């Protein structure tokens, strides 16, 4: 060739010019290679898997032939393609492609960019999958505190804001249950400006209400529950 | 054959940027500055270029990593800006949710 079109159609894919295969070579293993280019309609596809050792029968229209066997396989949109991200996002586990903070601390190093920024919370405290949520941020944060569970202000003084229309609940706050003292949490939620919400056994030490927001419900006499630590 | 050779315009105009942006592993004097696109000759593929300070030269190319000089610093090369791994790592970012209309 003094024709560069394998060349063009390589970089134009960023593949090497070995894993380009043009539609009318019917010489070459389709082995390795990930590009084909149909010469009617001066299209590039991505290749789906094939196995070893086969040749093209035909390309037409979005399909290509390969024998042995005369198989017929859909070409795929090229990896760099509007058509592949859209495809992948779509799919159905399609939401674990979207980041989130994994926890209080890290939310505090993340600066929001415009103002109602929507980001998602794994959890409070790493490790623990509890506490998580959506927040939204206020890019000028002054006149907000950070509580630890519902304002998270950033170190350059944004606040993230837990979105949470009614009570809060001692795991937005850090608590762990089981066998870990949550008095703080605990704390944190009567002192926090809405009514708690108790959906587990707590152990605290001593709590105090305080304000007239301090309302505390669970849901029966036994399950949820404050319970005092041993020593206090 | 010679000077048939359009290697330059093909990587430039795969990543939509000026003849100028593009620059080749094996290229060890033109300055990195204004550079968008370094292609790899050995492994025929384009990347992105980070952030380097004026004055820079490629050092060496290889396996994802440009080392430059004054300083024989490496850095990472990025995937291009228009890729579908760009795609995935922006969004697979901690504050990605915000990508979501
Ligand atoms: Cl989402």
Not at chain 1, 50 to 56: F, K, M
Not at chain 2, 54 to 82: C, F, H, R, T
Request: hydrophobic share 35%; net charge negative.
């Amino acid at each position: 060739a003094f024709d560069r079109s394998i060349q063009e159609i390589a970089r134009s894919a960023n593949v090497k010019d070995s894993e380009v295969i043009v539609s009318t070579d019917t010489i070459s293993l389709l082995d390795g290679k990930k590009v084909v280019y149909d010469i009617a309609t001066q299209t590039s596809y991505g290749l789906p898997t094939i196995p070893d050792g086969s040749v093209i029968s035909s390309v037409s229209a979005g399909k290509l032939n390969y024998n042995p066997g005369d198989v017929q396989v859909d070409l795929l949109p090229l990896e760099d393609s509007f058509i592949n991200v859209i495809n992948t996002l779509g799919r159905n586990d399609g939401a674990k492609y979207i980041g989130e903070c994994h926890s209080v601390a890290d939310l505090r190093n993340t600066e929001p960019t415009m103002d109602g920024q929507r980001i998602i919370l794994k959890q409070h405290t790493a490790g623990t999958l509890l506490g998580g949520g959506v927040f939204r941020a206020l890019i000028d944060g002054t006149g907000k505190t950070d509580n630890n569970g519902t304002v998270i202000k950033t170190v350059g003084g944004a606040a993230w804001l837990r979105v949470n229309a009614d009570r809060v609940n001692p795991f937005m706050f850090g608590a762990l249950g089981g066998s870990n003292d949550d008095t703080i949490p605990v704390q944190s939620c009567v002192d926090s400006g809405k009514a708690t919400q108790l959906t587990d056994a707590h152990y605290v030490s001593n709590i105090q209400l305080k304000y007239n927001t301090s309302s505390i419900y669970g849901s029966g006499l036994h399950y949820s529950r404050l319970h005092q630590l041993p020593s206090a | 054959s010679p000077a048939f050779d359009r290697s330059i315009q093909e990587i430039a105009r795969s990543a939509n940027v000026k003849d100028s942006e593009v620059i080749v592993s094996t290229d060890t004097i033109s300055l990195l500055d204004g550079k968008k696109v370094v292609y790899d000759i050995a492994t025929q593929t384009s990347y992105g270029l980070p952030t380097i300070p004026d004055g820079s030269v490629i050092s060496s190319v290889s396996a994802g990593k440009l080392n430059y000089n004054p300083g024989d610093v490496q850095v990472d090369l990025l995937p291009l800006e228009d890729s579908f791994i760009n795609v995935i790592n922006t969004l697979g970012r901690n504050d990605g949710a915000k990508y979501i209309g």
